[PDB]
Design a protein around this nucleic acid. Structure first.
Lengths: 1201, 52, 155, 103, 92, 16, 52
RNA sequence: AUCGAGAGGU
């Protein structure tokens, strides 16, 4: 009656049956579209304009009020309207092919209203509005187009079966979770931020004048979701002042207000009240002693009105009357102070209570009673997914659209023109803004590009199925990528189960870019009202009636960072809340953290909290199953039975949700993990349980197995248990076999290199015209596989091959991380691949005249024709599929008319009227035209895409890698006869050097080879899942059972001499990957060619025939060598040699005519004394740039002593 | 396993992972891997080695 | 070790274990039972200077408890620290102390009021308690008992 | 302190005072440190970007020289028509800004 | 440490020379009171419910039970706490 | 929604 | 190969006994530090000395 | 062509 690992994997299988790997993106977007858009519309629902009566002296002057109310929003399915005006439903593949944004139009119900003031003599603002005119029904008005995330509930592919996906040219394996903007796929990278409504106390480092700072980043639940931030700074002890003063930094205040003054502005004038707010214990004298100096500092202000005046004088406005200053101070104190607590009248008591709480926390850290906060604790951070981000963007864009509508109202009213609702809205605002933000990633308005966030949207990575899965689950921390702050980059303890420990890029973004674990769930947010209602009805004492003195031992209750009140029995409250969540009466995303030392009960329901699921251990006092998992074997058998059953209703099967709603699985975030005790496996629970039942928990232990620490006797109750430790890994770390037998940076290196492995990325790559694609001819699934691969679908779309690898020193061509590849194996298709590239062109147009034509250009009329071949183009200016092209051969023929007024030296004969703008093939590439797609673009102009294919056979210089960070290039290829063989005639496909193994300590590579050999011999698949009881001893026994040396060695013979090698070789199958780094993609040589126009130096880039940079370090190396002429050649004769004539009198470049051999300096009237200077063109450019700043850099060739 | 010159830090409150109790200074809790690469790391050891 | 002690810097705060400001009206008597024995011994021996200055001792008693362990570690005697304080503040501060064998190391201090100050500025005089708080702050951090400045610790 | 005033003071400095100040009278006279004439670099320093088409979009320095000359023409026109002194300053402190941000 | 009984502000120390006594007088109003002792200045230079705290089988003096949580200070000395009566111990 | 999506996909020729 | 990372059974008994003795020593070190029986090294706080 | 952003390689 103990849970097994097979049962754990059945539970995980159910999880992934009901959960997609793109679930976070999809659910966030669904939340944004279904709910957040309506809330954003409502928050700015009404627009009102009051036309007062100007005193023009004409009888008939009456004030008017015009009102526009924005109603419900309607989102249709994505559609396209053509040039001819026909409107059709649009499908993702057509959008990808024709470069169309896959967006759905949005309509909003607007209603208009006009009212007349009852009397015009009333003071402004007191006019009574009588209903004059009103729209009987609303007008459904198109306001914009929202890009639709693929596979979301509003996509055309939602609820669509596999067969219909094929009919649409869609891969059933594709998970969606992205957008199509102008044909390109864009994924929104989750953005990490610090949580709002949390008080964080930070110790400022010396010699900063501030000792400690308590900061809260207050955000309204839905009212723009984050505006105000406050600080409470304690100032450092000074030799002049015997005490430290507490000053509150508030929005829109130029100075730090002493805390007592802001308390008085809140009505807590008496000192006793203030120190009861701050120091809840009268008997504690250190707190009051530290508060005394600020009371001393703030005695000059003893009343609320004087405190408000003090605040107002320090507002951003100077030279204002006292009444306005007091009004402004009260307005700031009400609205811009702690808006998450409240923003409405009569709530100064709660804000004062929370301010006292913040001061108490900061002084607890200043007394060194509690440690400061950890800025990097994962439970204090939130992930903004597509939902929240698109919500902020749409709020901004809808505000801009409403401003436009209001300006339209004002302009129409001024001119007495009739107001039309349809003409009022500039629908281009929302459409263009969303399109621009999703396309460029620059997050915000086009006009605030520098201040906007960047890189929020990235082109989806279609190199391998696993790389795409990884890209859909990527988080970015917007820390400075140049500043060297190792702490944010480090792997925190709280990352356990939330972020992948291994998968993180190497380089500047190491540790900042993170990847969600397999079972990590990111909350989308839920209402806090039901939870507050349950708290109120269960005995929550409101904060208005709370008196700390009466109940100092009672526990503060927070919800979303709002101190709602105080409870007297927080244990029972917490058990009741947890029970409710365990029935889903409360949302499963709700964090219920009881902090016993701090006497707090924090509830969280907001979005962005990363959670992970865990088993629940039965802890009920009267239960007969103390210390045993709630989930029985019966529940597992139910999962197996309902997995296959399809006759059952799809929504009424027993699966993952049935476990959560039944109280057998619980989602915990990092905040709640701090209050739980988690067993690492059911066997650990059991061992602890016998240890606690008096049994010795002792037995004969397989010496080959991992050694675990003995069960801790100090642990008597476990609250949870992990479903499987292997779930702490990401997409790519879950493809590594035996990752727990490797040195961790090798796991990171494999996680990075698995993205670049060649395979089949989508099944529909044939019908997709991608810019770049690399496809493996004969992909094979690994012989050694992890159980997590079933959910990553690596067996379905693998990205490598099982090569027979021998670890041997054979001819010395595999040294320094090179490999030797069998040439016969290459000839038979090993690691062969296809490279597809796509060239896009289209017809342009300006005004009413088309200035481009897809045609076969003719030498006799087209000016400036390229040097490539125009003979492979067909009559329609294009190139047919199946033809062979190379280098600069033209694949698309396009011409542009020239203005009739242009006269280019007569080179443009009377026949020459056009100019060639054709598209040549890349100079460094050649192949066969695979495909030529022809269509029309959004503007009804012709639009062509030419896909070329080119087979790449492995050769010397091509990167290959194992799944263990073992990367190399091919150094040499030997044929079948020349390679070492076994007594069966097995010849390895690859030979790798032994020296790669010891230093790197990639023992997982050797264990993989042995296990793959066993599985190839026996046919059973090899389980390489981490943290299993699969030992090398068991694999050795299995291998010996097949008549092989147990450790994987084989007697091999020399191919050259047939002699039996003195050493026995480690030979067996290992999964290798062809990497996107091919030598021919990189080989580059330049003799001469293009130069930059400005500097006249070799251009940059292999693709554009550019030179290589001779940098500062190379110059230093040649200096230390002493090779003066080498430097002169590299930096002058080979880059930008140039000649000028300087005047020997003034030292400035002269006017030189070499044709006439006449030189002149008008300034000096010099025509005889000149010098010839050889210098870099960049030097002459620098000198001219200086002369443009009135600096005269003068070159004198003779010592002017 | 050593992070910033010291044993694995208490990133939770007085524990390194939610699998140990508070104030556990024992070798296993703070990042001592008694296993070899051949034998395999336990999940806690795997995480600590990843941190290093 | 002797040279190490001569080098390591030890201010009053280093040796001070606690400080207090009591209101003890009688310079001869003491409100603290622990202070009776040594104060009685101090006043057992008549002294003309002390006998005269007795009336100038304010009732604000600045008390300082010093850790015996830190005195042993730094090899400091109560006479030495008392003399250092007196030289640091000359005559403004009358001081008395107990013997080393005393189970508690206590220094009692008072401010010898200046009789040359006419009582005609009663609107700005600092209450003697605030002046003594400033004095204690200055004592804890300024007065150096031994060692070399800026050499906090020695190995 | 207007550029005119500083320029006048700098032309009123003596050669010996320049030598004492460590200022070169032959190459770096102080009054020359005030811009009365602005050199215009050749198009070679500031070429026009021609994107495989009928483009003459010019360079950043070309645009800023256009702005500087426009502001200069504005100041001259204001000083000609007899515009109010504040109108003249409107373009004076704008020409100064254009030159400063050009360099 | 005291507050004014009139306006509830802070009472500051003061010397009454005529009687030579220590008083606590409000600096906002005219109220004043006699100090009990008013030592002006002092310059010192439920855990059984937590399931994450380590437990011990130590003896409880009060109720003579055996279950007890413990935790370090915040010297790595242990404070124990009984799980039946809630009494806090010391290592003795 | 699934049925509507199926209807829209299958008849894309007729609805065009 | 994987056979070169394997040490015989007696050697693994040696390794296990070494690690057990190290764990024992750390256990009495923790016990002593929990009873103020660990004299701090000169210029080293008790926690730092225990960690070292 | 220019500029900006991003993904990568050693």
């Amino acid at each position: 009656e103990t849970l097994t690992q097979e049962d754990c994997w059945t539970v995980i299988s159910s999880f992934f049956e009901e959960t997609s790997l793109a679930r976070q993106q999809l659910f966030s977007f669904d939340e944004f579209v279904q709910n957040t858009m309506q809330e954003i519309v409502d928050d700015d629902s009404t627009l009102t304009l009051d036309q007062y009566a100007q005193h023009t002296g004409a009888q008939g002057d009456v004030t008017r009020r015009y009102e526009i109310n924005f109603g419900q929003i309607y989102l249709s399915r994505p559609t396209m309207t053509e040039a001819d005006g026909s409107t059709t439903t649009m499908f993702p593949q057509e959008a990808r092919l024709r470069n169309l944004t896959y967006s759905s139009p949005l309509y909003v119900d607007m209603r208009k209203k006009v009212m007349v003031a009852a009397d015009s003599n009333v003071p402004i603002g007191e006019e009574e509005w009588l209903v004059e005119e009103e729209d009987e029904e609303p007008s459904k008005v198109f306001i914009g187009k929202i890009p639709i995330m693929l596979r979301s509930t509003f996509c055309i592919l939602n609820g669509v079966s596999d067969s219909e996906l094929y009919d649409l040219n869609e891969c059933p394996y594709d998970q969606g979770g992205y957008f199509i903007i102008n044909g390109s796929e864009k994924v929104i990278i989750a953005q990490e931020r610090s949580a709002a409504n949390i008080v964080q106390v930070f110790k400022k480092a010396a010699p900063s004048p501030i000792a400690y700072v308590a900061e809260i980043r207050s955000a309204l639940e839905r009212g723009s979701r984050l505006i105000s931030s406050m600080q409470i700074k304690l100032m450092a002890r000074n030799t002049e002042n015997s005490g430290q003063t507490i000053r509150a930094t508030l929005p829109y205040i130029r100075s730090d207000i002493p805390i007592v003054i802001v308390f008085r502005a809140l009505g807590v004038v008496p000192d006793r009240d203030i120190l009861e707010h701050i120091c809840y214990d009268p008997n504690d004298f250190q707190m009051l002693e530290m508060m005394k100096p600020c009371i001393e500092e703030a005695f000059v202000i003893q009343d609320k009105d004087i405190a408000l005046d003090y605040i107002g004088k320090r507002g951003s406005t100077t030279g204002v009357t006292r009444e306005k200053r007091l009004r402004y101070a009260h307005d700031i104190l009400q609205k811009e102070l702690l808006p998450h607590i409240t923003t409405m009248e009569g709530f100064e008591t709660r804000k004062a209570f929370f301010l006292g709480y913040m001061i108490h926390r900061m002084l607890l850290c200043a007394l060194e009673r509690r440690e400061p906060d950890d800025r990097d604790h994962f439970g204090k951070k939130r992930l903004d997914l597509a939902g929240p981000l698109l919500a902020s963007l749409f709020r901004m864009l809808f505000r801009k659209m409403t401003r436009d509508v209001y300006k339209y109202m004002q302009k129409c009213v001024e001119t007495n023109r009739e107001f039309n609702l349809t003409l009022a809205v500039k629908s281009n605002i929302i459409t263009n803004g969303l399109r621009y933000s999703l396309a460029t990633g620059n997050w915000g308005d086009q006009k605030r590009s520098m201040v906007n966030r960047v890189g929020v949207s990235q082109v989806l990575n279609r190199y391998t199925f696993a790389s795409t899965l990884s890209h859909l689950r990527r988080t970015n921390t917007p820390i400075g990528r140049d500043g060297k702050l190792a702490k944010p980059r480090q792997l925190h303890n709280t990352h356990w189960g939330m972020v992948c420990p291994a998968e993180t890029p190497e380089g500047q973004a190491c540790g900042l870019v993170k990847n969600l674990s397999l079972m990590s769930y990111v909350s989308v947010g839920s209402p806090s009202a039901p939870i507050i209602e349950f708290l109120e009805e269960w005995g929550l004492e409101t904060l208005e009636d709370y008196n700390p003195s009466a109940s100092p031992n009672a526990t503060k209750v927070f919800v979303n960072g709002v101190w709602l009140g105080v409870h007297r029995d927080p244990a029972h409250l917490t058990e009741t809340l947890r029970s409710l969540r365990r029935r889903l009466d409360i949302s499963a995303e709700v964090s219920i953290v009881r902090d016993i030392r701090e006497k707090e009960l924090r509830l969280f329901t907001d979005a962005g909290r990363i959670c992970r699921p865990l088993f629940i251990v039965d802890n009920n006092p009267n239960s007969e199953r103390r210390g045993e998992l709630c989930i029985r074997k019966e529940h597992i058998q139910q999962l197996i039975e309902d997995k296959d059953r399809y006759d059952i209703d799809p929504e009424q099967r027993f699966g993952w949700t049935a476990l959560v709603s039944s109280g057998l699985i619980e989602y915990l975030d990092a905040e709640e993990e701090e209050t739980v005790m988690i067993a690492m496996s059911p066997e650990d629970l059991e061992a602890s349980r016998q240890m606690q039942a008096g049994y010795e928990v002792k037995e004969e232990l397989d010496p080959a197995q991992r050694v675990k620490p003995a069960p801790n006797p100090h642990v008597h109750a476990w609250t949870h248990c992990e479903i499987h430790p292997a779930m702490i890994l990401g997409i790519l770390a879950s493809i590594i076999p035996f990752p727990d037998h490797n040195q961790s940076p090798r796991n990171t290196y494999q996680s990075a290199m698995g993205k670049q492995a060649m395979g089949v990325y989508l099944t529909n790559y044939q019908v997709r015209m991608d810019t770049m694609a690399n496809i493996l001819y004969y992909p094979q699934k690994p012989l050694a596989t992890t159980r997590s691969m079933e959910y990553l679908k690596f067996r379905e779309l693998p990205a490598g091959q099982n090569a027979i690898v021998a670890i041997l020193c054979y001819s010395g061509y595999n040294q320094e991380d090179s490999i030797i590849m069998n040439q016969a194996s290459i000839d038979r298709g090993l690691f062969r691949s296809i490279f597809y590239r796509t060239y896009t062109d289209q017809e342009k147009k300006i005004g009413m005249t088309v200035m481009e034509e897809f045609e076969r250009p003719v030498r006799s009329t087209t000016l400036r024709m390229k040097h490539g071949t125009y003979d492979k183009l067909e009559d329609d200016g294009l190139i047919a599929p199946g033809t062979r092209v190379s280098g600069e051969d033209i694949i698309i023929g396009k011409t542009a008319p020239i203005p009739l007024d242009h006269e280019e030296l007569g080179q443009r004969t009377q026949l020459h009227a056009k100019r060639d703008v054709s598209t040549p093939l890349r100079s460094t590439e050649s192949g066969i035209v695979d495909q030529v797609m022809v269509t029309t673009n959004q503007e009804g102009l012709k639009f062509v895409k030419v896909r070329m294919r080119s087979t790449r056979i492995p050769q010397i210089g091509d990167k290959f890698a194992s799944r263990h960070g073992q990367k190399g290039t091919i150094g040499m290829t030997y044929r079948h006869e020349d390679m070492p063989f076994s007594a069966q005639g097995i010849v390895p496909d690859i030979i790798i050097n032994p020296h790669a193994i010891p230093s790197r300590m990639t023992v997982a590579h050797l264990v993989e080879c042995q296990l793959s050999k066993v599985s190839a011999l026996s046919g059973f698949e090899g389980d390489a899942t981490p943290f299993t009881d699969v030992t090398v001893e068991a694999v050795s026994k299995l291998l010996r059972s097949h008549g092989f040396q147990s450790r994987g060695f084989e007697v091999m013979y020399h191919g050259h001499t047939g002699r039996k090698l003195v050493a026995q070789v480690f030979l067996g199958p290992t999964y290798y990957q062809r990497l996107k780094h091919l030598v021919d993609d990189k080989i580059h040589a330049r003799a001469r060619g293009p130069v930059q126009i400005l500097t006249r130096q070799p251009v940059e880039g292999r693709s554009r025939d550019g030179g290589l940079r001779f940098g500062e370090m190379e110059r230093d190396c040649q200096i230390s060598h002493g090779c003066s002429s080498v430097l002169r050649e590299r930096l002058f004769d080979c880059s930008d040699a140039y000649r000028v004539i300087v005047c020997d009198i003034c030292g400035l470049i002269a006017i030189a005519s070499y044709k006439k051999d006449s030189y002149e300096c008008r300034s000096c009237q010099n025509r005889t004394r000149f010098s010839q200077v050889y210098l870099p063109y960049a030097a002459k450019l620098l000198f001219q740039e200086l002369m443009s700043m009135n600096i005269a850099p003068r070159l004198f060739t003779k010592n002017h002593k | 396993q050593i992070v910033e010159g010291k044993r694995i830090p208490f990133g939770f409150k007085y524990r390194t992972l939610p699998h140990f109790p508070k104030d556990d200074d024992s070798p296993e809790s703070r990042g001592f891997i008694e296993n070899s690469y051949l034998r395999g790391l336990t999940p806690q050891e795997f995480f600590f080695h990843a941190m290093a | 070790k002797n040279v190490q002690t001569q080098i390591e810097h030890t201010t009053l705060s280093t040796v001070t274990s606690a400080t207090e400001i009591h209101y003890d009206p009688d310079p001869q008597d003491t409100v603290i039972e622990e202070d009776k024995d040594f104060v009685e011994a101090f006043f057992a021996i008549p002294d003309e200077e002390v006998e005269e200055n007795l009336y100038k001792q304010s009732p604000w008693l600045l008390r300082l408890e010093l850790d015996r362990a830190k005195m042993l570690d730094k090899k400091l005697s109560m006479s030495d620290v008392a003399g250092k304080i007196a030289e640091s503040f000359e005559r403004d501060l009358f001081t008395i102390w107990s013997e080393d064998n005393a189970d508690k190391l206590i220094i009692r201090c008072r401010i010898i009021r200046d009789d040359d100050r006419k009582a005609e500025d009663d609107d700005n005089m600092i209450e003697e308690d605030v002046f003594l708080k400033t004095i204690e702050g200055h004592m804890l951090e300024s007065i150096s008992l031994r060692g070399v400045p800026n050499i906090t610790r020695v190995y | 302190l207007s550029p005119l005033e500083v320029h006048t003071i700098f032309t009123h400095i003596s050669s010996e005072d320049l030598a004492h100040l460590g200022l070169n009278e032959q190459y770096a006279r102080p009054d020359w440190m005030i811009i009365t004439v602005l050199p215009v670099p050749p198009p070679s320093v500031r070429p026009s970007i021609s994107v495989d088409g009928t483009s003459r979009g010019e360079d950043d320095l070309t645009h800023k020289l256009s702005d500087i000359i426009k502001a200069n023409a504005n100041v001259r026109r204001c000083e000609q028509e007899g515009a109010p002194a504040h109108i003249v300053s409107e373009y004076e402190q704008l020409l100064q800004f254009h030159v400063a941000t050009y360099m | 440490f005291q507050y004014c009984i009139e306006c509830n502000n802070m009472l500051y120390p003061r010397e009454d020379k005529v009687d030579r006594v220590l008083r606590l007088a409000c600096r906002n109003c005219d109220y004043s009171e006699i100090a009990a002792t008013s030592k002006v200045y002092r310059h010192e230079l439920d855990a059984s419910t937590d399931p994450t705290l380590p437990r011990s089988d130590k003896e409880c003096p009060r109720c003579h039970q055996h279950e007890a949580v413990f935790y370090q200070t915040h010297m790595m000395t242990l404070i124990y706490v009984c799980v039946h009566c809630g009494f806090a111990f010391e290592e003795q | 929604l699934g049925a509507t999506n199926r209807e829209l996909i299958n008849n894309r020729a007729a609805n065009r | 190969g994987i056979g070169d990372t394997i040490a015989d059974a007696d050697t693994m008994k040696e390794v296990t006994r070494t690690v057990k003795e190290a764990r024992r020593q750390v256990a009495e070190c923790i016990q002593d530090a929990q009873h103020n029986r660990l004299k701090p090294e000169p210029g080293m706080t008790l926690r730092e000395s225990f960690e070292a």
